[PDB]
Amino acid sequence: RYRVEVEVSPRFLAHQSTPDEGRYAFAYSIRIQNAGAVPARLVARHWQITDGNGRTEQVDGEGVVGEQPWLRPGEAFHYTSGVLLETEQGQMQGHYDMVADDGTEFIAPIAAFVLS
Template identity: 60%
Template sequence: MTERYKIEVSATTEYLEHESEPERDRYAFAYTITIVNRGLVAAKLISRHWIITDANGHEQQVRGEGVVGEQPRLNPNEGFRYTSGVVLDTPIGAMQGSYQMLAEDGTKFDASIAPFSLANRRLVH
């Protein structure tokens, strides 16, 4: 049986060479997130919580309303995609977190974002 509240999150990343300055330990990355409502109830993305870790183990947490200025409402099997960015002090890092969701029936739940890596592939071979 399908779960009432189920959000699927996937990510792709890209190293932004033209926005990075390795000589200053500044590595820029874009990440594209795809969110799909696999549940049975429409839900709105209320807020986000990111945990971003660089290769030195330095962690930063980011919390805020919505994503890219929006709080998308997703009907069952509907998706939303957005691209954002992050700057690290190292050429390798990782992100993970969660979206706080509000279902149409008033239920609040979290949609977890599995860890994904950020890497300047040219520097990590």
Template identity: 55%
Template sequence: MSAPEHRIEIEVETRYVEEQSDPAGDRYVFAYTITILNAGTRAAQLLARRWVITDANGRVQEVEGEGVVGQQPVLRPGEAFRYTSGAMLETPLGSMEGVYRLVDEAGVGFEAEIPRFTLAVPGILH
């Protein structure tokens, strides 16, 4: 369990982007909207992210970078930041998981785990 000053809650919503996908060409595009809530007692700045994206064939892509959608938001206790981004898979089913790297107002670095979530074309899962 993380310290009470470092409590980050993450919610994810996903959507299949049919108009950008090409199943015949093994191109499946998904959008995901993430809400990051600072449920801790200290302000924190999101500095970087690391994603592990796995498709149904077991192919893994790892993506690392600064911030999210070109921003490094500062979240005071109780504040949330919401953004939408996307991923492309070669299969109609896959998953994503990862970690956000943050630093609190005292300069202490910490990580928030992004729980695994599923990317699926509607109707692919029963």
């Protein structure tokens, strides 16, 4: 009864980034699709980004970009985000906290993609 698959596609931004000064800019799009039986919404988000040097940065905010979308079964939500990286390579994994209408609590892990 609880299922949510999210897909993210990053892309290098050479026109809006200067890697020569240690400034790499990657833009990624988020695709939240609800595959559970009961409607669910995203109330919180926590990204665990780890760079090629082992150091990692954790970020915690509300549901998504300041909104708590109520994804209904079969429906999906999508928005564009922007993050900056110190190097031209890196791996980012994270999860989304969601809640069913009945109050059941559960998170939606986000697959780990790489940037190059």
